C-alpha cells in the first residue's frame, strides 16, 4: 500500500435521533451518509446538518449509529455524478460534476481538489449532495464521455518521474523526453 498515493477521505453512515421528551415519545430517526477524514469529523458534519435542516442540535440529540461504508469493488472503475452546493465570494451556486474512479471517496477527493483548483472553493464552503454512480449511457460531461470509447489508447507523453536515488544532479548526456 502507498500512503503517499492514498488520500484519507472516507464515507461514513451516521444515524441519530433527538432525545425523546415528554412532548414527543418517538422522535423520527435521521440517517445520512457523508464524507470526512474520520468518524469524528463525520459526526460533526452530521450534527451540523441536523441543526441546519432540522431543529435538532448535538445537545438535544443522541447518536444511534456511525459506521464506515467500504466500496464493494475497490478495483472496478465506475462513473460518478455528484450534485453540489457551494458558496462563492459573492453568492451560492449549485453545480453537477462528473468523475470516474474506483471508490466514491476517491471521487469526492477529486471533487474537492477540482473545486479548490478551479473556483477557489475551500472545503468549508462545499456541501456534497447526492453523489451516485451513473451509467455510461447518461454521462454528461465531455471529459468523461471521451473516456468511454470502445477501445481507448493514447501515448504516454508524461515526463519521467524517477526515484530520488537515481535523480542524480550531473548527467553524462542530455536525456530524452521523447521516451519509448
Amino acid at each position: 500500500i502507498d500512503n503517499s498515493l492514498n488520500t484519507n477521505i472516507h464515507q461514513y453512515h451516521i444515524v441519530g435521533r433527538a432525545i425523546p421528551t415528554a412532548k414527543d415519545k418517538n422522535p423520527n430517526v435521521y440517517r445520512m451518509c457523508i464524507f470526512a477524514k474520520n468518524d469524528t469529523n463525520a459526526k460533526s458534519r452530521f450534527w451540523y446538518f441536523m441543526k441546519k435542516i432540522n431543529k435538532l442540535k448535538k445537545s438535544n440529540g443522541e447518536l444511534l449509529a456511525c459506521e464506515q461504508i467500504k466500496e464493494r469493488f475497490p478495483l472496478r472503475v465506475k462513473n460518478y455524478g455528484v450534485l453540489l452546493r457551494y458558496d462563492s465570494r459573492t453568492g451560492t451556486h449549485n453545480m453537477y460534476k462528473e468523475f470516474r474512479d474506483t471508490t466514491k471517496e476517491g471521487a469526492i477527493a477529486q471533487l474537492y481538489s477540482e473545486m479548490a483548483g478551479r473556483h477557489r472553493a475551500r472545503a468549508s464552503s462545499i456541501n456534497i449532495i447526492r453523489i451516485s454512480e451513473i451509467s455510461s449511457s447518461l454521462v454528461r460531461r465531455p471529459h468523461i464521455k471521451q473516456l468511454l470509447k470502445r477501445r481507448l489508447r493514447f501515448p504516454a507523453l508524461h515526463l519521467p518521474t524517477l526515484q530520488k536515488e537515481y535523480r542524480k544532479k550531473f548527467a553524462s548526456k542530455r536525456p530524452s523526453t521523447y521516451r519509448m
Binding site: 453512515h13 440517517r31 451518509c33 461504508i69 447526492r130 451516485s132
Partner: protein
C-alpha cells in the same frame, strides 16, 4: 459466517435502496417544480 454475511449484506442493501429512493423523490420534486 455465511448467515452473518447475509445479514450484513441486507442492511447495506436497504441503506442503498433508501438513498436511491431519496434521490428519486428529490429529482421528482425538482421536475414538478421546474414547470
Amino acid at each position: 459466517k455465511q448467515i452473518q454475511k447475509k445479514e450484513l449484506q441486507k442492511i447495506n442493501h436497504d441503506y442503498y435502496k433508501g438513498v436511491a429512493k431519496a434521490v428519486k423523490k428529490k429529482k421528482k420534486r425538482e421536475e414538478k417544480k421546474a414547470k
